[PDB]
Design a binder for this molecule. Structure first.
Ligand SMILES: C[C@]1(CO)Cc2cc(NC(=O)c3cnn4cccnc34)c(N3CCOCC3)cc2O1
Length: 291
């Protein structure tokens, strides 16, 4: 389809079985949730869609949420690429965004094997890492800073192609902000300080690469270390090796390409923003990894 659709709130209420908050397996429509809303499964033109019902689930106001709704429509109309999620339409008559359905959910869900899905192979993980970098490259080439790169915001289509999502906090382009937003466990030190730079998206992508390698979430309150980015120091201070942390749920990892991905992640995670590779270099390094 070649146009954006304006849906009435009643149609979206109807096709999501009245925004049925029960999970998919019990006969509900809830697919997941983020900091800015619940995502529901919908069925429109004999077509499955994803419907995000916006809600300030984190620490933001009604005006900030409406601003993110506007920003997401604007950024998604402007940024249409094979490694970005596709906006289909919207409803504002109770704010809703309607997207092309991603049948394999998020990278975060697949790394956790949520609902009994089989673990992703190392081969699949390399392809996803490359696809995600290509999406970030398009945004950076088009002077957009994502500001919320994380595994929950990397979606997977019918062919497990990586599709970057959640453009509500995205910024057109180093500027400083009095409004520090994002997910702590993934944020660069300068972003936690209020800086707005594409260099911070690189850092956050480094944390995603560690999640891909290890299968571990960026943060776990009942784990030691609680933060995944700390493993870079554990490995640097030779108290651990990458082999100690490689996801045991894969059978096809090899030391050469795993060490190549870890080297990319390490460079992305440089504490000094100017020493980090830019996205074009990250793409080159990830392409060389499987060459
Ligand atoms: C296997 C299934 C069913 O159990 C299929 C499925 C699709 C989506 N998402 C979408 O289809 C989707 C498409 N565009 N989009 C934009 C933002 C968020 N989600 C989406 C999600 N998401 C929910 C929100 O958090 C991320 C994962 C989970 C999920 O699980």
């Amino acid at each position: 389809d070649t146009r954006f659709h304006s849906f009435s709130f009643y149609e979206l209420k109807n096709v999501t079985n009245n925004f049925d908050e029960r999970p998919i397996s019990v006969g509900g429509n809830k697919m997941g949730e983020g900091g800015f809303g619940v995502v529901y499964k919908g069925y429109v033109n004999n077509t499955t869609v994803a419907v995000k019902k916006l809600a300030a689930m984190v620490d933001i106001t009604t005006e900030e949420l409406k601003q993110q709704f506007d920003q997401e429509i604007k950024v998604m109309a402007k940024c249409q690429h094979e490694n970005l999620v596709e906006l289909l339409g919207f409803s504002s008559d109770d704010l809703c965004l309607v997207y092309v359905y991603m049948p394999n959910g998020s990278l975060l869900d697949r790394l956790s094997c949520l609902d009994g899905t089989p673990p992703l192979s190392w081969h699949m993980r390399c392809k996803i890492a490359q696809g995600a970098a290509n999406g970030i490259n398009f945004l950076h080439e088009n002077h957009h800073i994502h500001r919320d790169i994380k595994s929950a915001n990397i979606l997977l289509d019918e062919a497990f192609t990586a599709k970057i999502s959640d453009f509500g906090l995205a910024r057109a382009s180093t500027v400083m902000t009095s409004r520090i937003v994002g997910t702590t466990a993934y944020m660069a030190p300068e972003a936690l300080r209020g800086e707005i730079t594409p260099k911070s998206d690189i850092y956050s992508f480094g944390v995603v690469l560690l999640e891909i390698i290890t299968g571990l979430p960026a943060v776990d309150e009942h784990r030691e270390p609680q933060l995944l980015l700390d493993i870079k120091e554990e490995i640097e201070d030779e108290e651990k090796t990458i082999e100690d942390y490689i996801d045991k749920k894969m059978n096809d990892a090899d030391s050469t390409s795993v060490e190549a991905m870890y080297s990319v992640a390490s460079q992305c995670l440089h504490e000094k923003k100017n020493k980090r590779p830019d996205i074009k270099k990250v793409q080159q390094l990830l392409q060389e990894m499987t060459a």
